């Protein structure tokens, strides 16, 4: 299985809302989604895992909890599944990873993750609306 | 295709040092609770120690604190448990599991258990 | 600490019978509540988390029910293979302690 991550850059203004989002790629098979981000470091990776807003994969895996924070999980019946980052601060830009992990129950388990970057801007070179 | 080979079990001196280690084979460790859980021969279960997935969290049977230590290294996709001081009550088949606690949901569907390795402490 | 209590301590049933055990917690859980199976010779079995759902592979006939301090484990349709104990445990509060367990016997 592989998994699509449709945008590889996401610039958008303070207070806007976004939607990040990947497509996973197609018995006892089942498959578990999740988002985090990597850490606010030098160089930016997936193989870092840090909460989104103080939210933990577990926490945001595929609701009450992340509306307080503003955040929002869902999933489509067609593979699609999204993070929404509401009222966006110049701190939410970083790196943000979408998580798969394909579970063959009691016999193998397939993880993978897609990445995309999240800008967040203010003042005169910042852009209108998320573009 | 999926497993969580134990080893470091066996006949150890009362008071004396035990170091079991619980390796994953067909699933990795690093996005998963771990605990190890205890039976003595004809009795209950008995959870020991737990570790989350990045070694924040961790808990203790109280029998078992300042005695036992429970660590993992997800790069070796293994799980430790460090006794110390081991009682004649410490005498028991010790499991490792990928099982609910300090697992936030992620993935409380599926578990996974070792086959079990015994430790016993006698003279 | 919360500490976990089982009702019956044994249950001897014919098979086809409906088995309804019981799991007391000396104060509310968090439903972080599971319920295992161990057969002899063999690891335990996690049949339900959360209460209520069941875990992958594990037939219909096991359901969990209830909340806060009681909670209940039905086997509807009891088989011969159904023979083990089964142990509650809670796993939101550390220690993440097991309940004594239910041993369920099937009459011949």
């Known amino acids: 299985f592989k998994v699509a991550t449709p945008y590889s850059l996401y610039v958008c203004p303070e207070g806007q809302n976004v939607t990040l989002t990947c497509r996973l790629l197609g018995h006892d098979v089942t498959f578990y989604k999740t988002w985090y981000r990597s850490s606010r470091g030098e160089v930016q990776t997936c193989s870092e895992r840090r909460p989104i807003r103080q939210l933990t994969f577990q926490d945001l895996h595929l609701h009450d909890l992340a509306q307080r924070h503003g955040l929002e999980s869902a999933s489509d019946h067609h593979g699609n599944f999204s993070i929404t980052m509401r009222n966006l601060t110049l701190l939410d830009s970083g790196l943000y990873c979408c998580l798969v992990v394909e579970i063959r129950h009691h016999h193998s388990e397939h993880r993978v993750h897609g990445a995309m970057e999240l800008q967040v801007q203010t003042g005169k070179d910042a852009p209108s609306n998320c573009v | 295709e999926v497993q969580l080979v134990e080893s470091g079990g066996g006949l150890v001196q009362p008071g004396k040092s035990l170091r079991l280690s619980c390796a994953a084979s067909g699933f990795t460790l690093e996005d998963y609770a771990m605990h190890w859980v205890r039976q003595a021969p004809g009795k209950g279960l008995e959870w020991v120690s737990g570790?989350?997935?990045?070694?924040?969290?961790?808990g203790y049977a109280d029998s078992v604190k300042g005695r036992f230590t429970i660590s993992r290294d997800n790069a070796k996709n293994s799980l430790y448990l460090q006794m110390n001081s081991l009682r004649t009550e410490d005498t028991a088949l010790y499991y490792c599991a990928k099982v609910p606690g300090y697992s936030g949901g992620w993935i409380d569907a599926e578990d996974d258990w070792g086959q079990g390795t015994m430790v016993t402490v006698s003279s | 600490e919360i500490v976990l209590t089982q009702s019956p301590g044994t249950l001897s049933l014919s098979p086809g019978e409906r088995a309804t055990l019981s799991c007391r917690a000396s104060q509310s859980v968090s439903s972080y509540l599971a319920w295992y199976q161990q057969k002899p010779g063999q690891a335990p079995r996690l049949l339900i988390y959360g209460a209520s759902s069941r875990a992958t592979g594990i037939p219909d006939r096991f359901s969990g029910s209830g909340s806060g301090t009681d909670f209940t484990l039905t086997i509807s349709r009891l088989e011969p293979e159904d023979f083990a104990v089964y142990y509650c445990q809670q796993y939101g509060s550390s220690p993440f302690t097991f309940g004594p367990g239910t041993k369920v016997d099937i009459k011949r």
């Open positions: 570790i989350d997935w990045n070694s924040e969290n961790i």
